[PDB]
Structure 1
């Protein structure tokens, strides 16, 4: 850092932000956030763990699936509504939990998020971070409609009386579920944070320094089963990264699983969820677990075609973290309902072009997976050979 850099940010941000109808993609918000957030806002929000390979891979794995559209289908009308955990949604996507929304929206934080999700014609579920800057209560209450669903995302405390009280205050507030996050027993190392944070004593800590009393690094399957007895809210495990765990989730009867790697902020070299979903849906089908568990997916969703690809492989919904945080930060609640409109229209426009008219018609045979597994690395390309080499050239232009 903040080298009285605000003068520029602020200027940068001065009705400088282009109007909202100039916004085209979910990438526009991101480029906008990248310029106008504070350094600490950008580093926290945008970073992934270590080399950020997983974070990037989450997005690219969607780039390896192609479609097999049907033509000559009457697509005058399309429906994109579905049911996620007993409830019925207008769209098959949601706002995932992201701690610290005030870094970006200092006056309204997550309140603004609730607003955008319910103030327009499309109403979208909002997952609530146990690490939210605002309180559950200011949040559930800020929702402008009574048709909008809210989900509580829980981190279990090492002091479990705290998660007792917690669960109890969330069911009395009307959240429709609990997402239990399991991929952060220890905190991933986001080097972007730390770098800017070296800007120049705790009292002991080493790798240990990444441990936390808020995240019982001791959670187990067994704690999940004790949780089912203390509540009515359907239970969803957030952070599954292999098939065998998904099969564990059904074996002990939770309601869902979210195939997630924390948006690439936890273990680097975890696979894209999109690929775990694909390995996974058929295994479940094969043992009779498919009507038994709803599988969610998050990580690198930036387009409606990405949403349609996770939906054809079997997902019930798919979540988005960063795009919303960015929309929320340059334009508050209005930037958020706009990001929702952008998404909703890509899905519908894409659906007509694939030749289907409802979510239930989304199936794997609309996809080409041939190259999903073509995650590759080439041989270090040859310097000396590419350097002296000169390629073709176009026709110049002319005289004067």
Structure 2
């Protein structure tokens, strides 16, 4: 019923954009379009990408820099580069090794794995791929309090060192590709099966999101932090007022995101929202930035604009489709090498230096 790729191999990554077309040749049509697609006619996914041309990097010369160091620290974790893996559901749509393959790439590379509540793999299967590597658990909340306590407890017992509350998906975005393809999951989701009564296999994302909590309030941020005793990120923030609210409600981190343009349509590109959120956060908690990171220049620009790290999504999954853990690893390696070049050319010896960069304002936008 679903024949995902199974080959494991390193891949030569020239750029991450070319991975999308390459993955379209190996991933079944429905699954591929679930991964690649976005809301409406995808204008906000294009905005995520074109937003990077709004703020341009300066080359800097005679900066006394050599062999830049990409390493950084977040919430007590030293990581190889200032990027983590975003929480993404159902990795088995990309590759038979599913979340275990992604986890092995992430742990082998040296950064943090975010586990989706809508994983097709069990915590045991992901833990085998991680081999001790650090992990954060992304909760899609149950409506039932006890089921949230049980999910959180399972995640922390598996070794989670933060909780990501994704709050921007109380209902599905208008994902026209998935509507046209009548996309349903071809396998179950063991972590949230408890609140689907029946199995996620043959269900639409509309109906799984429909089972999760719609009426998320700030109390939920408080109650997740109190129960887990772990730092809580609030993910999906695009408006500075939600950042201030989340922090005052007990969040330990702000995760700036529009879900890869999969949720609200005719909204800004994610990168354009980052400065106003960073200025309102004003150093109170760490910021993770995502939605549209494709190049080392994007990592640099996010850091220069207030993000502590970025999260990587689609490009890593396309890498998993093309090579299993080694393909996914190839993408993480591409980003680290890509960033190293950009650090050398911007005069940046280390990740802190990137946070100090001035960017050129491009008022003409993409067409210039």
The TM-score normalised by the length of structure 2 is 0.88
In 2, Cα distance between the equivalents of 1:229 and 1:47?
36
Q: Match for residue 398 of structure 1?
A: none
Does the CA contact (< 8 Å) of 1:184 and 1:215 recur in 2? Answer: no
5+ long unaligned stretches in structure 2: 185-205
Q: Match for residue 60 of structure 1?
A: 50
Q: Match for residue 192 of structure 2?
A: none
- 1:143 equivalent to 2:135? Answer no
Does the CA contact (< 8 Å) of 1:187 and 1:211 recur in 2? Answer: no
SS at the partner of 2:268? Answer: coil
Range moving further from structure 2, 318-327 or 360-369: 360-369
Range moving further from structure 2, 41-50 or 81-90: 81-90
Does the CA contact (< 8 Å) of 2:274 and 2:306 recur in 1? Answer: yes
If you compute each CA radius of gyration, which structure gives the higher value, 1 or 2?
1
Structural RMSD (CA): 2.5
In 1, Cα distance between the equivalents of 2:279 and 2:232?
23
- 1:94 equivalent to 2:84? Answer yes
In 1, Cα distance between the equivalents of 2:226 and 2:11?
48
2:323 pairs with 331, 340, 352, which one? 331
Q: Match for residue 203 of structure 2?
A: none
Q: Summarize the alignment of residues 254-333 of structure 1 with structure 2, pairs less than 5 Å apart.
A: 254-285=251-282, 290=283, 292-333=284-325
Q: Match for residue 213 of structure 2?
A: 216
- 1:248 equivalent to 2:245? Answer yes
Evaluate the alpha carbon distance shift between residue 365 and residue 350 of structure 1 in structure 2; reply closer, same or farther with a 3 A threshold: closer
Q: Match for residue 159 of structure 2?
A: 174
How much has 1:129 moved relative to structure 2?
0.4
Q: Match for residue 342 of structure 2?
A: 350
Does the CA contact (< 8 Å) of 1:155 and 1:214 recur in 2? Answer: no
SS at the partner of 1:176? Answer: strand
Tell me how many residue pairs correspond in the alignment.
347
How much has 1:211 moved relative to structure 2?
7.6
In 1, Cα distance between the equivalents of 2:336 and 2:234?
26
Q: Match for residue 181 of structure 2?
A: 196
Does the CA contact (< 8 Å) of 1:186 and 1:211 recur in 2? Answer: no
In 2, Cα distance between the equivalents of 1:322 and 1:181?
17
The TM-score normalised by the length of structure 1 is 0.81
